[PDB]
Ligand code: HEC
């Protein structure tokens with residue numbers, strides 16, 4: 001197989017340049033992130049491993065939402081109003 | 088219901104200062120993003136809508152993996168070797 005060709009043909013270059021971050025991280029940045037985890041890169045490409053380069057910050061915020069699960073509709077609205085009041 | 092009190096009591100201010108980004112976005116930034124979208128803010132608080140303030144870069148990349156369905160193991164390996172060559 002020709003990895004460089006496949007990368008180009010599937011459009012991956014549009015967001016991934018060799019050394020420069022654009023819409024996506026540079027290939028150097030991705031390569032360095034997977035140092036000692038190289039099998040995991042193949043798993044990532046197969047949809048079988050989580051993103052490790054720029055992981056969604058949902059991981060920090062999502063558990064915080066469990067604290068709001070019992071709130072009433074009035075309490076949720078009040079909370080949202082408080083947030084919105086800033087500005 | 089008292090939104091400021093609910094916010095204080097659940098520790099939310101630890102990552103959500105009024106005007107300054109910390110581990111999380113400032114309340115001013117969140118409010119700006121949800122201006123005129125209070126309904127979406129409530130949905131978010133209920134765990135029913137993805138984050139919008141700084142939307143996941145992970146969400147841009149995830150659909151791209153569908154480009155690689157039915158590549159063979161050798162092709163996936165070549166693609167990984169190409170990426171890793173930029174370290
Ligand atoms: C934008 C329109 C993209 C295209 C087309 C492709 N990728 Fe991408 N990629 C993009 C972003 C914004 C990110 C950061 C989010 C993240 O998941 O890290 C990435 C990331 C990757 C990674 C790193 C995965 C990780 O462990 O975090 C890899 C290995 C990767 N991208 C590869 C890749 C391939 C092979 C593509 C063509 C099929 C491809 N990307 C397209 C944005 C975009």
Ligand code: HEC
Nearest residue numbers: 057058060061064067097099101102110111138139140141
């Ligand atoms: C760090 C330990 C956090 C605590 C405690 C709380 N939040 Fe948070 N929040 C955090 C991060 C890293 C992010 C960005 C990820 C994301 O979901 O955007 C957020 C985001 C929010 C948002 C905006 C969501 C969006 O559309 O972008 C809101 C409205 C929000 N957080 C509210 C909130 C509440 C009410 C909290 C206490 C129960 C709370 N956060 C705690 C990090 C952290």
